Amino acid sequence: KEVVLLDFAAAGGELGWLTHPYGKGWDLMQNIMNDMPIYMYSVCNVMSGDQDNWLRTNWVYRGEAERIFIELKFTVRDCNSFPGGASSCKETFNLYYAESDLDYGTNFQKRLFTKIDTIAPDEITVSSDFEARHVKLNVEERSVGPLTRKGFYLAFQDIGACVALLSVRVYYKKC
């Protein structure tokens, strides 16, 4: 019933998402756990101010899809949990999309993106949870459409949160 267009957790870290700026900002992290590779897109520049960190997906061919469903699983760390810890810290990030008939390739083009929503965690990671070695995984879902162009990008803007994306699943529904 759900036809998967993009699946970050399963994609072995090979999608070539684009980050702006450079390599300061969002960072692709890899480890192996339970003899299964594991990917997190992470950023935590909570100390220095004026953070504007963008992450853009590969281009997704829409095909039959007219309404898409974007499921995210992420962690967000408590702004008071930083020994030191700045007044530039935030606990949300922004989700955007862009439709086009054309690949952008490598010029990022934030100006063509439309804001879907502010994404806020139900479960904030606190210093206690590091002690228990247990993960508070937020699950949030948004919907966009109708889509009418050949393809689309998702993008993520961080403005100074300590965020990890574990899962980004994009699908449409066929009945």
């Binding site: 960072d27 692709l28 992290m29 890899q30 480890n31 192996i32 756990m33 594991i38 997190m40 992470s42 950023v43 935590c44 520049n45 909570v46 100390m47 962690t75 760390r77 930083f82 990671t125 949870d129 590091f130 228990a132 070695r133 247990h134 993960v135 508070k136 300590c162 965020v163 990890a164």
Partner: peptide
């Protein structure tokens, strides 16, 4: 260099690369 803080407890498991 990236000396930034640990995003979540998954980071306690060694071998992470960036």
């Amino acid at each position: 260099a990236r000396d930034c803080p640990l995003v979540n407890p998954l980071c306690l498991h060694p071998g992470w690369t960036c």
